[PDB]
Amino acid sequence: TEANPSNLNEDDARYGFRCCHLKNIWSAPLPPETKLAEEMGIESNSIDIMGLQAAYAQLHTEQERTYFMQRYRDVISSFGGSTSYDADNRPLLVMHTDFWASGYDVDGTDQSSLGQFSGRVQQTFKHSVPRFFVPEHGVMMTLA
């Protein structure tokens, strides 16, 4: 929530924010506040089995939310409904491309560099956005 580009720090402002590593077991853990146990109160000597039933149901709603419905839009999708991008002010994703960056090695050829190599990665790529209709004034930003 920085208010001005001037509230950003050296690195961020010049290179952009940092993003998440590709997903793996250690970089895609369940949200840190994930419940590991759900307590349910009980009268000194008895337990309301009907309440216990509700308790679970309630928990279920809580979990679903924590695990994958943390964003309003996703909760509404949960019900089988939908939301315009104006509903939560989300930028509209118009096109997403992804590709691997490969290249070649350069062979060292002098007395000491003979048998050495330097990797030069150089990948060509196309990123094409199909004719899009702009309903209101604004910006079309493309990032990498």
Of 22, 25, 36, 93, which one interacts with a copy of itself (CB under 8 A)?
36
Listed ranges 11-19, 42-50, 115-123, 133-141: which one lies at the site for a copy of itself (CB under 8 A): 42-50
Burial status of residue 69 (CB atoms within 10 A of its CB: 0-12, 13-18, 19 or more): middle
Q: How far is the CB of 62 from a copy of itself (least distance, A)?
A: 11
Distance CA(126)–CA(129), nearest Å, equals 10
User: Which residue in 10, 64, 75 sits closest to 35, CA to CA?
Assistant: 64
The angle at the Cα of 71, spanning 17 to 24, to the nearest 5 degrees, equals: 60
Q: Is 112 in the site for a copy of itself (CB under 8 A)?
A: no
Q: Is 35 in the site for a copy of itself (CB under 8 A)?
A: yes
Of 1, 24, 45, 82, which one interacts with a copy of itself (CB under 8 A)?
45
Residues touching a copy of itself: how many (CB under 8 A)? 21
Q: How far is the CB of 74 from a copy of itself (least distance, A)?
A: 23
CB 70 within 8 A of CB 62: no
First to last CA, the chain: 21
Q: Find where tokens 């060292």 sit.
A: 108
Q: Is 50 in the site for a copy of itself (CB under 8 A)?
A: yes
Q: How far is the CB of 29 from a copy of itself (least distance, A)?
A: 18
| Footprint on this chain of a copy of itself (rule: CB under 8 A) | 35-52, 55-56, 59
